[PDB]
Amino acid sequence: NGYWGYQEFLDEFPEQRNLTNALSEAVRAQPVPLSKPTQRPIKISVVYPGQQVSDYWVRNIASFEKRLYKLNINYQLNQVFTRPNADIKQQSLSLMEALKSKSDYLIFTLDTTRHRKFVEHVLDSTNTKLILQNITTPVREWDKHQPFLYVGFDHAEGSRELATEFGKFFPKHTYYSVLYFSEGYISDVRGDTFIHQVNRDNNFELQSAYYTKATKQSGYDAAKASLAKHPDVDFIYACSTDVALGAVDALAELGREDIMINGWGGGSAELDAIQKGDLDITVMRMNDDTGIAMAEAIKWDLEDKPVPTVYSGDFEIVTKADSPERIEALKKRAFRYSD
Numbered sequence: 001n002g003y004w005g006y007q008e009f010l011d012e013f014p015e016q017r018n019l020t021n022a023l024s025e026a027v028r029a030q031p032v033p034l035s036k037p038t039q040r041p042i043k044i045s046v047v048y049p050g051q052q053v054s055d056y057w058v059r060n061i062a063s064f065e066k067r068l069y070k071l072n073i074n075y076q077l078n079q080v081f082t083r084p085n086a087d088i089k090q091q092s093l094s095l096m097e098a099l100k101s102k103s104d105y106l107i108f109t110l111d112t113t114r115h116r117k118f119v120e121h122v123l124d125s126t127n128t129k130l131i132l133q134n135i136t137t138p139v140r141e142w143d144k145h146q147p148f149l150y151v152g153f154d155h156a157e158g159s160r161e162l163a164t165e166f167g168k169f170f171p172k173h174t175y176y177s178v179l180y181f182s183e184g185y186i187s188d189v190r191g192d193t194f195i196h197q198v199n200r201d202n203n204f205e206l207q208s209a210y211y212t213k214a215t216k217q218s219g220y221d222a223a224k225a226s227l228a229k230h231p232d233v234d235f236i237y238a239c240s241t242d243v244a245l246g247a248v249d250a251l252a253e254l255g256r257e258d259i260m261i262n263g264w265g266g267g268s269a270e271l272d273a274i275q276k277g278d279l280d281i282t283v284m285r286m287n288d289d290t291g292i293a294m295a296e297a298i299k300w301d302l303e304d305k306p307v308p309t310v311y312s313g314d315f316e317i318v319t320k321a322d323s324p325e326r327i328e329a330l331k332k333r334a335f336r337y338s339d
């Protein structure tokens with residue numbers, strides 16, 4: 001709460017549903033280069049998390065850049081990567097550092113339930129247009145001055161999808177445990193969604209839930225702790241890729257192939273795990289649509305057209321039973337720009 005649902009926000013503001021639908025159609029269709037020429041190259045700053053097992057951020061940037069080049073948009077890209085185990089203070093520092101640069105657009109990610117007012121205050125203190133990655137639920141407080149774009153793949157949707165699938169894999173009252181992200185927005189929107197739906201619809205019983213540092217090692221450690229205290233579960237729900245892959249390592253170590261485990265995002269490492277059989281299911285992002293959306297949103301802004309506040313991309317479900325052909329087809333769709 002303090003957030004709009006994606007679909008709810010689109011229901012409340014039809015103009016926005018039009019703008020977002022239009023953007024989706026623009027993403028789907030062939031590049032249509034910049035109508036109105038620019039005065040000079042546009043300056044773009046990026047603050048993203050580096051050194052993760054998840055390829056989402058790097059792929060995102062790659063697709064963004066490809067699409068910019070095809071729209072004949074002339075840009076300069078200053079990329080900053082935050083070291084892992086980087087505090088939120090450290091992230092905020094990287095962020096101010098990037099604001100010094102006085103760029104036209106700033107693309108970044110930050111926990112908005114832990115640094116809500118910080119971001120609200122950055123918003124009110126620069127002419128740089130902000131794009132918030134990996135969030136698709138606009139903040140209610142910010143009605144006076146929303147950022148230029150919230151962009152991502154809606155966490156609650158993907159979680160609902162996973163919930164529905166686990167509902168098919170297992171009978172009512174199944175015991176399970178959860179591996180959250182770090183405390184904050186992602187855990188709330190991927191984990192609690194899942195727990196709520198699964199409890200309400202299938203009467204599953206949660207045996208334990210653990211926060212992580214959002215790293216592979218942490219998902220491994222947390223899986224080990226969790227199974228040490230609660231060995232008897234039929235599956236573990238993981239809130240993210242790195243945590244899932246750590247947990248897979250732990251499950252192999254403890255010899256627990258009787259436990260099911262999901263991925264979250266469906267990037268390359270996950271798809272490999274799925275094809276190996278290590279990961280049982282995932283919800284796959286059609287990854288590149290969000291890089292392209294951002295490039296399309298900047299075009300419109302430069303052609304002086306209205307830009308929607310939010311854009312979410314779509315998902316597919318993938319299981320270890322899917323054929324190589326299905327997988328390759330999905331990769332063809334998701335990594336069309338970033339390969």
Ligand SMILES: C[C@]12OC[C@H](O)[C@H]1O[B-](O)(O)O2
Nearest residue numbers: 054056239240241242264265
């Ligand atoms: C993008 C992301 O969101 C949280 C984490 O940064 C990534 O891991 B992930 O692939 O599970 O989704």
